[PDB]
XYZ file of N, CA, C and O in Angstrom:
456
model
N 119.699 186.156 -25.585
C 119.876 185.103 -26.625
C 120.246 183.730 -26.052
O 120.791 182.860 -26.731
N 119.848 183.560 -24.484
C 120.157 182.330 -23.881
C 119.502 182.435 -22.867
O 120.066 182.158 -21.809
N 117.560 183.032 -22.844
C 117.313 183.176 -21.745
C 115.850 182.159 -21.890
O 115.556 181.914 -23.060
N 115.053 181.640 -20.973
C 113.813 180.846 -21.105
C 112.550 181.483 -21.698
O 111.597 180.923 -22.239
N 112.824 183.126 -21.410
C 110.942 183.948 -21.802
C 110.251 183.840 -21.197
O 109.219 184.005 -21.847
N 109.886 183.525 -19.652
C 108.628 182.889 -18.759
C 108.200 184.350 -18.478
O 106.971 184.404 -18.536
N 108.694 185.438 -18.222
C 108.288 186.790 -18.238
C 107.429 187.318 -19.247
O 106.435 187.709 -18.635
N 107.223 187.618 -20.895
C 106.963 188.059 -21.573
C 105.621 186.359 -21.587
O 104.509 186.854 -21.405
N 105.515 185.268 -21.686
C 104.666 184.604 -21.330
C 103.893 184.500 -20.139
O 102.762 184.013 -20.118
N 104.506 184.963 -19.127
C 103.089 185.240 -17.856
C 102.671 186.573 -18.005
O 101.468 186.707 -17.780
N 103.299 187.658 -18.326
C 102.264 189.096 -19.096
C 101.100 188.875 -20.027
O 99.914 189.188 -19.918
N 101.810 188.211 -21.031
C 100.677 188.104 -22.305
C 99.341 186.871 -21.600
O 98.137 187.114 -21.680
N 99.868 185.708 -21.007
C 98.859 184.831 -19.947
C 98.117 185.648 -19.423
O 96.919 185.642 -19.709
N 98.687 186.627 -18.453
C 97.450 187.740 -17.313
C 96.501 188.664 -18.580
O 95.707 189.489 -18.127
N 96.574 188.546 -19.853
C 96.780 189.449 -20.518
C 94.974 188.414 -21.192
O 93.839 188.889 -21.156
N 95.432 186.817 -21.780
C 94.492 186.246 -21.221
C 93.082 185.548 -20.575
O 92.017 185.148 -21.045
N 93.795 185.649 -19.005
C 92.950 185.462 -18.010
C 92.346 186.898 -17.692
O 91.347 186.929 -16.974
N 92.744 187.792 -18.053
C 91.819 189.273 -17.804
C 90.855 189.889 -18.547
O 89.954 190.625 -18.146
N 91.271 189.304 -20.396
C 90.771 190.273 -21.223
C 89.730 189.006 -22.167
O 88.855 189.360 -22.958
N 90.126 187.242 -21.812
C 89.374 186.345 -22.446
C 88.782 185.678 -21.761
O 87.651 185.328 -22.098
N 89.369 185.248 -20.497
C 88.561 184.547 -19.393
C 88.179 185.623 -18.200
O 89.269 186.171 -18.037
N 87.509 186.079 -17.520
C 86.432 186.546 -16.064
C 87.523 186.157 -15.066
O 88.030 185.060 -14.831
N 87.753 187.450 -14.510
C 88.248 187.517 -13.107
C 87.562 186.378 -12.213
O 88.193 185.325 -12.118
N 86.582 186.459 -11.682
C 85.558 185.516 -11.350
C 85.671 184.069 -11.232
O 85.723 183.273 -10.294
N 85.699 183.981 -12.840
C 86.539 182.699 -13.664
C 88.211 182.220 -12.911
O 88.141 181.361 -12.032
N 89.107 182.566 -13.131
C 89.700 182.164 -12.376
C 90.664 182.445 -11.142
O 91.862 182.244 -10.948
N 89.800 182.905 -10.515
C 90.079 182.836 -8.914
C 89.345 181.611 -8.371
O 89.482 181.443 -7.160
N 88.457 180.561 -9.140
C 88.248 179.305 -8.899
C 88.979 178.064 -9.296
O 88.752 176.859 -9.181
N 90.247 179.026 -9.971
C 91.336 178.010 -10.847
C 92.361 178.305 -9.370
O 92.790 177.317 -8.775
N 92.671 179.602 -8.899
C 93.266 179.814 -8.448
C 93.188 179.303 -6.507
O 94.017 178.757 -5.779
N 91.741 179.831 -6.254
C 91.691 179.330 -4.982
C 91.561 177.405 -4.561
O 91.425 176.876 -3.458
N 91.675 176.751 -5.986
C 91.902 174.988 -5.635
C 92.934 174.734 -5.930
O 93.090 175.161 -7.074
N 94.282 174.013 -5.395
C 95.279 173.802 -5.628
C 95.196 172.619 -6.709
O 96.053 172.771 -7.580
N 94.495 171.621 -6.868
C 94.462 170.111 -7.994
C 93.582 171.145 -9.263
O 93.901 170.796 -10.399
N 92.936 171.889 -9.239
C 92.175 172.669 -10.427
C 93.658 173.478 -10.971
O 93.947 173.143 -12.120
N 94.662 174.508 -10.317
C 95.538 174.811 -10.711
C 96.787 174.051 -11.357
O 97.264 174.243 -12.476
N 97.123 173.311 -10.565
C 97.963 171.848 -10.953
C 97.572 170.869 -12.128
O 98.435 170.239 -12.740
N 96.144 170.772 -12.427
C 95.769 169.950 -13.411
C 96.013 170.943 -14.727
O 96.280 170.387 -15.793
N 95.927 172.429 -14.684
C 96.391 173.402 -15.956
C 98.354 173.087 -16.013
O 99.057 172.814 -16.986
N 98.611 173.215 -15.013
C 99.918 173.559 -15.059
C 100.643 172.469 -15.370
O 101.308 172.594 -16.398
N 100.746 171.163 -14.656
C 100.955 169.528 -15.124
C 100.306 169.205 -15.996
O 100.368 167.977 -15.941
N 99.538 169.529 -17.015
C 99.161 169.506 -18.209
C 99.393 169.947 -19.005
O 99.350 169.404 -20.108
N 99.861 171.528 -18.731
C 100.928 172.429 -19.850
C 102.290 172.748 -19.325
O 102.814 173.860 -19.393
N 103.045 171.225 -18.572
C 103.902 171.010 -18.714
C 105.166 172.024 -17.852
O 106.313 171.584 -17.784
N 104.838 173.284 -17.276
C 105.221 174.826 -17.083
C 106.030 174.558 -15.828
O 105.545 174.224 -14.747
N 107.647 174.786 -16.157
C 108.385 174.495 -14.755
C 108.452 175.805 -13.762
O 108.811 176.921 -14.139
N 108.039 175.469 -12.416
C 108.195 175.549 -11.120
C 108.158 177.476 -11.131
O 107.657 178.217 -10.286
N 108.762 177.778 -12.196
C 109.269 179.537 -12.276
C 108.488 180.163 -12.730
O 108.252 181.215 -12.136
N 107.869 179.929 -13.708
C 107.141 180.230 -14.743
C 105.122 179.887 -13.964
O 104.146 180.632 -13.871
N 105.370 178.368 -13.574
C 103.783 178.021 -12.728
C 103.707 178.650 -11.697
O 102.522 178.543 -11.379
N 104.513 179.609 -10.506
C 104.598 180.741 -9.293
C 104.283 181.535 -10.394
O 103.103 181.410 -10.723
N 105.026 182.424 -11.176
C 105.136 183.682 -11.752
C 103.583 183.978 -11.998
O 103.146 185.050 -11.580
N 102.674 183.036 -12.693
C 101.427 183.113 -13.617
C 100.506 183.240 -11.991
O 99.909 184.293 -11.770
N 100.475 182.324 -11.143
C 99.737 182.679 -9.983
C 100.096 183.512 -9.215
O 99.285 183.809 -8.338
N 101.173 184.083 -9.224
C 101.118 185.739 -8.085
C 101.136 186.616 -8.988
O 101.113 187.721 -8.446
N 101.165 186.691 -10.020
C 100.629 187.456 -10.843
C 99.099 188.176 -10.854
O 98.636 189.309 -10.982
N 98.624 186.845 -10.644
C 96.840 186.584 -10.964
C 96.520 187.364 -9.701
O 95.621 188.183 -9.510
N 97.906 186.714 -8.502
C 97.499 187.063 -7.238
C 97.555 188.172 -6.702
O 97.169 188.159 -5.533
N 98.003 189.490 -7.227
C 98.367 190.593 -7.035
C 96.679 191.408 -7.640
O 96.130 192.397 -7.154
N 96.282 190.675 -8.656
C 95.037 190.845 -8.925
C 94.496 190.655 -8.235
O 93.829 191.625 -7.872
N 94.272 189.368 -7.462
C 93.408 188.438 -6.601
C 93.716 189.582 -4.828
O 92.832 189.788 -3.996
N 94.856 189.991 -4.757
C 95.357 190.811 -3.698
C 94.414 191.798 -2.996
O 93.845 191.655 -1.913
N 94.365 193.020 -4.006
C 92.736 193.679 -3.760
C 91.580 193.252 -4.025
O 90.889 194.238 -4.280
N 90.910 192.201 -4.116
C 89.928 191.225 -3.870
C 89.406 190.652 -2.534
O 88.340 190.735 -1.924
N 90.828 189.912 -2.285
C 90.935 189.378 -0.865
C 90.794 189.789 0.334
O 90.681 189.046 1.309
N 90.788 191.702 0.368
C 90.878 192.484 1.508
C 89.091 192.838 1.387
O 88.841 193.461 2.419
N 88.172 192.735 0.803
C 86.506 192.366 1.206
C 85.929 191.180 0.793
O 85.079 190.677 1.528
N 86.355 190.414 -0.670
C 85.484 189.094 -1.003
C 86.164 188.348 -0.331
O 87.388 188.325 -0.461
N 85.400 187.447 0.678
C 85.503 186.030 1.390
C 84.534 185.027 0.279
O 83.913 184.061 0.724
N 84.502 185.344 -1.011
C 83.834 184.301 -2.021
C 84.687 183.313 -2.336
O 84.248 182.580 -3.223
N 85.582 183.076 -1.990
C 87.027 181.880 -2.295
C 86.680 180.566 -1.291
O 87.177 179.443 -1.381
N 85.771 180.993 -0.398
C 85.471 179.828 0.391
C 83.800 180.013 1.205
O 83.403 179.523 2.262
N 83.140 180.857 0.281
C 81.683 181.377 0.466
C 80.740 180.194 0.785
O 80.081 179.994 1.805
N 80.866 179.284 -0.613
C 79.955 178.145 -0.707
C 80.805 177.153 -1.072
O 80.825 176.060 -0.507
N 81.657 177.520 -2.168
C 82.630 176.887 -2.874
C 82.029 176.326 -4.103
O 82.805 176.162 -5.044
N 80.764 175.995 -4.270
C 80.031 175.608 -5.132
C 80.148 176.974 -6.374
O 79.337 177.900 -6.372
N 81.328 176.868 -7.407
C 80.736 177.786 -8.995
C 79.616 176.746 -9.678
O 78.558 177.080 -10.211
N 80.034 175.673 -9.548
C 78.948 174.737 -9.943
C 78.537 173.840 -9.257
O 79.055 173.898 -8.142
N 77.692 172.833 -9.392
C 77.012 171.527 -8.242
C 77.958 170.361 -8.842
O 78.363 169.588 -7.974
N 78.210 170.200 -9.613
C 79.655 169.056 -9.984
C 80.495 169.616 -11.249
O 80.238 170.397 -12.165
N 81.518 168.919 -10.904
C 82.949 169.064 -12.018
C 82.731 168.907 -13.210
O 83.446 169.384 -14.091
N 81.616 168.150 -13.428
C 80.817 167.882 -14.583
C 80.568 168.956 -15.525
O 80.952 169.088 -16.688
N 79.605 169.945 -14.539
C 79.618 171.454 -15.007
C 80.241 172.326 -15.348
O 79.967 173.204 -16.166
N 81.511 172.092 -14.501
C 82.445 172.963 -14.536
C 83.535 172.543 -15.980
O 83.704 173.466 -16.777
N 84.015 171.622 -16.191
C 84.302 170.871 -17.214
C 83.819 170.355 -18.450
O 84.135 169.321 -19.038
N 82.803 171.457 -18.822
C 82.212 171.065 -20.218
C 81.906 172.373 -20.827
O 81.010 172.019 -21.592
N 82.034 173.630 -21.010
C 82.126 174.724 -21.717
C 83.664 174.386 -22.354
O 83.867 174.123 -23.539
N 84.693 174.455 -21.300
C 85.784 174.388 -21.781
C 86.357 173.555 -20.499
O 86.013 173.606 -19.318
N 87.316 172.800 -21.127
C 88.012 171.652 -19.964
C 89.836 172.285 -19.623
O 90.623 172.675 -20.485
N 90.046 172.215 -18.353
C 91.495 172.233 -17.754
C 92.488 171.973 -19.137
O 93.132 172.998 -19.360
N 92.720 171.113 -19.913
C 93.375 170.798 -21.417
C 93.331 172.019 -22.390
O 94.252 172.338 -23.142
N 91.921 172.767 -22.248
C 92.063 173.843 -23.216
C 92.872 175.368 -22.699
O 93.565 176.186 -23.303
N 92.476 175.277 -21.542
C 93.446 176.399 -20.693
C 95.065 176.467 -20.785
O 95.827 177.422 -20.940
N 95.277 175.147 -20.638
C 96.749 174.220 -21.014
C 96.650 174.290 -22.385
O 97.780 173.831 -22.549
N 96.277 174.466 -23.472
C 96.367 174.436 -24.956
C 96.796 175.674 -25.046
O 97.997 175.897 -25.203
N 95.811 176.741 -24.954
C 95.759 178.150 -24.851
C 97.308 179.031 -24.211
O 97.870 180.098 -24.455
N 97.478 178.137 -23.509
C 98.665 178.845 -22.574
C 100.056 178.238 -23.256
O 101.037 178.981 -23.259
N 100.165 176.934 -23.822
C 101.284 176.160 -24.540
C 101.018 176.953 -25.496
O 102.101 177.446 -25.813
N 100.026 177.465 -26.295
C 100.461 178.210 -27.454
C 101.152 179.866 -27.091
O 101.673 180.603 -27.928
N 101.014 180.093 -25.951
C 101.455 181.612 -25.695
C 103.117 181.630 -25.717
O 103.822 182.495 -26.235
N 103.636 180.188 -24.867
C 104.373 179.316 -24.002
C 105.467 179.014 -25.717
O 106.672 179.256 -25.787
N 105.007 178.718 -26.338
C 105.541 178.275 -27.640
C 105.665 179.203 -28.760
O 106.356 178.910 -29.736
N 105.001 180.364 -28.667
C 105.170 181.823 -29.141
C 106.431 182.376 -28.317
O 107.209 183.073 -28.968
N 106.724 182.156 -26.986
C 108.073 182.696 -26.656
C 109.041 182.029 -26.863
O 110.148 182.568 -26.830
N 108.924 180.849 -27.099
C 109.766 180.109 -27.331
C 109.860 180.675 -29.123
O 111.020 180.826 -29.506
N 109.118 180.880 -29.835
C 108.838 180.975 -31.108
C 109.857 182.688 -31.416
O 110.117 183.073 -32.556
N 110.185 183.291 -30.424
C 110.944 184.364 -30.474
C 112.288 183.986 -30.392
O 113.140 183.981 -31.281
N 112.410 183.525 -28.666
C 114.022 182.991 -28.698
C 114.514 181.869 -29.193
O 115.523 182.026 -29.880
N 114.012 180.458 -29.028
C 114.538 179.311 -29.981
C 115.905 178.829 -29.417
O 116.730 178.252 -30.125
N 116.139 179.166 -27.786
C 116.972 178.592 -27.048
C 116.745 176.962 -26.661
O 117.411 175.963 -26.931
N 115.628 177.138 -25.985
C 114.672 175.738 -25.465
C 114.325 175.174 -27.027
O 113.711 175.760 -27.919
N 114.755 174.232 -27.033
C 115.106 173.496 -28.521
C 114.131 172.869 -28.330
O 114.191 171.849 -27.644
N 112.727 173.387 -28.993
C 111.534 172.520 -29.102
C 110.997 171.814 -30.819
O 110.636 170.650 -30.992
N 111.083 172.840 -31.854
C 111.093 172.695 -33.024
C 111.321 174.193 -33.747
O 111.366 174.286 -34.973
């Protein structure tokens, strides 16, 4: 009754990136550090909570890493950012995740948001 929730919000997040967005999908969020940072400095997510959601992913990403060398294959998922940024943009990932983010908050009501 005086705790932040970043736990029960990076479960339901992996929960997500596994079952709404493609493995595939983001391990290209994950293997660029400014593609990860532009979700996370956009949905605002302090320091505990932005680790927790990527070794999370990364424990996924863990048995991956021991045969796919696709994290630095071509590097090309698309031929510009252009591409990559118009199904859905870095803001909606950050929308998606502030609403998970604001559902825990929406339980405890410590972090005095509304």
């Amino acid at each position: 009754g005086s705790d932040p929730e970043s736990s029960i919000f990076i479960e339901d997040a992996i929960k997500y990136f596994k079952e709404k967005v493609s493995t595939q999908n983001l391990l290209l969020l994950l293997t660029d550090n400014e593609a990860w940072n532009g979700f996370v400095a956009a949905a605002e997510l302090p320091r505990n909570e932005a680790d927790e959601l990527r070794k999370a992913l990364d424990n996924l990403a863990r048995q991956m890493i021991m045969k796919d060398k696709n994290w630095h294959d071509k590097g090309q998922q698309y031929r510009n950012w252009f591409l990559k940024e118009f199904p859905r943009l870095k803001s909606e990932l950050e929308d998606n995740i502030r609403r998970l983010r604001a559902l825990a908050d929406g339980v405890q009501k410590v972090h005095k948001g509304t």
